[PDB]
Amino acid sequence: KDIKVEPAKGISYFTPAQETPAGTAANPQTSGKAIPKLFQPITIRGLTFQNRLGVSPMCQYSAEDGHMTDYHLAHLGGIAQRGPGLIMIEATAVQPEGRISPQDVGLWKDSQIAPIARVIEFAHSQGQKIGIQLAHAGRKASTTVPWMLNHGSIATENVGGWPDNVKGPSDIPFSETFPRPRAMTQDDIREFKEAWVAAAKRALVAGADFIEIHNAHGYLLASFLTPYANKRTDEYGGSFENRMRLPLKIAQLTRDTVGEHVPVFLRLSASDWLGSTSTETWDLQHAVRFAEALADQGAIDLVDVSSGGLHSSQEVKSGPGFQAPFGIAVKKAVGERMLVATVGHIRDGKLANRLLEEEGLDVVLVGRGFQKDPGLVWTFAQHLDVEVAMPGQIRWGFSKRGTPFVDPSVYKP
Amino acid sequence: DIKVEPAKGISYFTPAQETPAGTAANPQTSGKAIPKLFQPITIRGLTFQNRLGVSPMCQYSAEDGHMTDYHLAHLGGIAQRGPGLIMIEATAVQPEGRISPQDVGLWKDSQIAPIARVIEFAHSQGQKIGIQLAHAGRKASTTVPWMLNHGSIATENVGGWPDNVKGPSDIPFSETFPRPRAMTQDDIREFKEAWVAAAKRALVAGADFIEIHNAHGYLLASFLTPYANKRTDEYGGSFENRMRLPLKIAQLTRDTVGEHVPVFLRLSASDWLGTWDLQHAVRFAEALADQGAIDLVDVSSGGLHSSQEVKSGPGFQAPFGIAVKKAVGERMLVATVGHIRDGKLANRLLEEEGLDVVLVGRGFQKDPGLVWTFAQHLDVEVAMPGQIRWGFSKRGTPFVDPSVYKP
Ligand SMILES: Cc1cc2nc3c(=O)[nH]c(=O)nc-3n(C[C@H](O)[C@H](O)[C@H](O)COP(=O)(O)O)c2cc1C
Ligand SMILES: Cc1cc2nc3c(=O)[nH]c(=O)nc-3n(C[C@H](O)[C@H](O)[C@H](O)COP(=O)(O)O)c2cc1C
């Protein structure tokens, strides 16, 4: 009668509200069929996710001095528009020299909050949840952007690199094309920990709903863990007991600065894909042990189980759900003390729901699949015959009345 | 020791895209010949990298004709995936010509920077984006399509103008639709004047082309449709009497735009009332190939009259354009739109039926990677932005192996 087009609430600008957020499955379900676990909500701390299909964090090598531009709104905003359970922002440097590339996002200054907040604000206008993977590239810092012919090389001070400011647990390079790391002094660690706390606060200011700690891909914290990159003879190296000291502090510190209401995640690498060797390697057993130590600690809410990037001589056997067995191995070890999410060439909805139902995991992350298909939530929903919400701008053409839910039978691939 | 170059001509930094997305490989690795779909088209001096384009789609997400951060996230991602051309939704030349109070507008000058920020991004990517200027005529002051009061009038309460609705006559669309006032000749004058001004600010926004909305029962269409255009004036009566305002706006648009700016015209080819029909359409279409002001005709259908009975279907309105192409030949280019959900149907529509451009609407809403998807349908290698293709590589080619990440 006089139904009005209501504005999304809390946003510096107008856009139509979405009353059911996109990616929310129909709870009654016209089919009468039950909603599969992939499209079942998850409440972690004071935060609920309409589904369990997340966008894994993905560096776009498109910021300037760590500042997001319009680009990232067009990038992330189109994906947030189509209803992913959660969006993770790319590795965001805590210190300038912890950037991977010179084009990385960073959050070591307050000028980098607004660029990110503008995107987090678009996600929020659509009713989505969005967060930030805090990172430090350790001995893999000051490299080249990876679509460049110079890819896999050192970023010189002429490209904006810092070849003489790469820091890590010890002074051993990752590769021969990679830079020479400088053993981090206690002054270094101290400031890194201060810088992590500083960056997390700016993230909450930007409007992140959760924080993920990047302790993976041989970047740092991960390098502290792997014995062959950390030959320190102090309390931060030596035993496995010691090599975890710093990761466990950052976990504690992140939880401290966000409080009790903000989910905290941790990404780790489960194996270094190093073939039979008699020396100490980062194998699944090590990962599960670290994961166990984290559940003892109580800080983290979820472990994000990736692999690789740890050692230059890896031999990763990529394939569909190839690193799903790692995350299973971790959930059997921690059970319901922590949640785990998996990632890695998860390409259809069946595999996704199965890794959550049969194999008993909590959250499925996709990366490349969203880059090629920003509507994967709709695609996966179609794989499992699930009716899911899509925003009004997008659904009304794929209709027949006034439900916020799309029939999985329409525009079937 | 290479450098990552910024894009050119843009406010902000963004990695530059040497080979635009949607650009096939001139020497296709497979040796297979580039299908027409992925063959470039040049209108005036403008060159499109493929014949797959984003059809104009309204988003009912604007405030005072102003675009927001939404349209950047909406068209942005779609554009990043290399659509040959991207058309901005119907931009109203007059406030009362808006379909809804949430339509994008170009009747003032504060409505340019909004529309230009998105064009700027498209340009940063190497893509060609244009704008469809329009007037809703008797179908204006209506509600958004996803709202329960869909197919109804927007009162001043919602921000509508149920009284300032101006069309070719007081003939309303339906009991649900608003009551329109027949426009005075001074009204038509003001309208034509508004169009020129709107096109002018569009060129200031960065438009690479302009499409005329002469379809869907809006003013220009309402004038060509006898059941709504009976003014007894030089505009009312003879088919020629009704074709004037349309043909005038065509020339006027060609006049305001230069000779290097392509100008398209979208028309409805039937009212599905079987009365405007493929015949009336082919006639008006030839009148356009005569005037020589329009470079491309966007053949569509529907919206002309309530009580219409559209028969939707894969390529349901392709025949309409094949007929227009028949009576126009190389005199004008023709574009088809309508449930084209795969590349094979699209390419065929181009090669086996001679048509020039394939336009997709909803396919892009569901899949802003449609071009990538149509590419795999025809085993075509296309460029994708360096930010997207690097992970899908086994390494320096801007093109993606259509075999990687296939359904
Ligand atoms: C382009 C690109 C950027 C990425 N950026 C990050 C990142 O910033 N932080 C991180 O932990 N992983 C990053 N990843 C790793 C992926 O997020 C994730 O582990 C996933 O495996 C990548 O591909 P997938 O869809 O097959 O799972 C990135 C991957 C790609 C392809
Ligand atoms: C959400 C939406 C918005 C649209 N906006 C416009 C428009 O602004 N101008 C126009 O001429 N047609 C518009 N259309 C019609 C389409 O652009 C076009 O006629 C056709 O539907 C696209 O073909 P396809 O959707 O079957 O791929 C719109 C259609 C939809 C679903």
UniProtKB/TrEMBL annotation, chain B:
Coiled coil: none annotated. It comes from the Eukaryota. GO terms for molecular function: FMN binding; NADP binding; NADPH dehydrogenase activity. Pfam families: Oxidored_FMN. InterPro entries: Aldolase_TIM, OxRdtase_FMN_N, YqjM-like. Residues 36-379 form the NADH:flavin oxidoreductase/NADH oxidase N-terminal domain. Transmembrane segments: none annotated. This is NADH-dependent flavin oxidoreductase. It comes from Aspergillus niger ATCC 13496. The lineage of its organism: Eukaryota, Fungi, Dikarya, Ascomycota, Pezizomycotina.
